[PDB]
Ligand binder design. Structure first.
Ligand code: RJQ
Ligand code: RJQ
Length: 113
């Protein structure tokens, strides 16, 4: 992408989505494992997105917009979640620091938007 989109946070987390029909969390992209998850700020239009890529093979497993007003829920000290119309996303962070720094960056983003 272009240089006007910049990463403002990176954390290690396993990305899950909620299978609405089976009432179970499943790995984003089909295989359980940790990803490197960034919050990218596109400075041109002041928008944000989350993109995560598996660490072991760089599969892109999440690429989702963070709109104004998004509700970000810290369900546990290492599992955080949010929605869009298509999926509920969950991040199982690799450590409490990963979770807390990612959440702080998300909250700062929600205030910038
Ligand atoms: C891990 C990471 O950011 N690395 C950046 C670091 C960077 C360097 C300089 C300035 C800003 C940044 Cl940050 C990077 O090396 N460089 C190489 C040039 C492309 C990129 C620099 C900026 C942009 C920000 C968006 C990100 C990017 O381009 N990304 C993030 C991963 C995502 C995955 C797949 C492909 C599919 C086509 C398109 C899509 N999904 O529609 N797409 C992406 O959008 C991918 N950039 C990059 O990698
Ligand atoms: C109003 C709303 O939008 N509520 C959402 C959560 C949310 C709140 C606020 C803002 C954004 C979101 Cl998105 C909700 O309750 N939604 C979405 C996913 C399905 C679920 C609804 C019901 C179940 C109750 C149990 C909870 C849940 O799913 N939980 C509770 C926390 C618990 C912790 C970790 C992960 C690990 C994998 C799995 C496990 N095997 O332990 N697991 C969980 O089970 C986690 N539900 C949910 O979150």
């Amino acid at each position: 992408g272009s240089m006007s989109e910049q990463s403002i946070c990176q954390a290690r987390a396993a990305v899950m989505v909620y299978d609405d029909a089976n009432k179970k969390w499943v790995p984003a992209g089909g295989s359980t494992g940790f990803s490197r998850v960034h919050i990218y700020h596109h400075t041109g239009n002041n928008t944000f997105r989350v993109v995560g890529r598996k660490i072991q093979d760089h599969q892109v497993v999440i690429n989702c917009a963070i709109p104004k007003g998004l509700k970000y829920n810290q369900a546990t000290q290492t599992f955080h979640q949010w929605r869009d119309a298509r999926q509920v996303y969950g991040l199982n962070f690799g450590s409490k620091e990963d979770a807390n720094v990612f959440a702080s960056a998300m909250m700062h983003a929600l205030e910038v938007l």
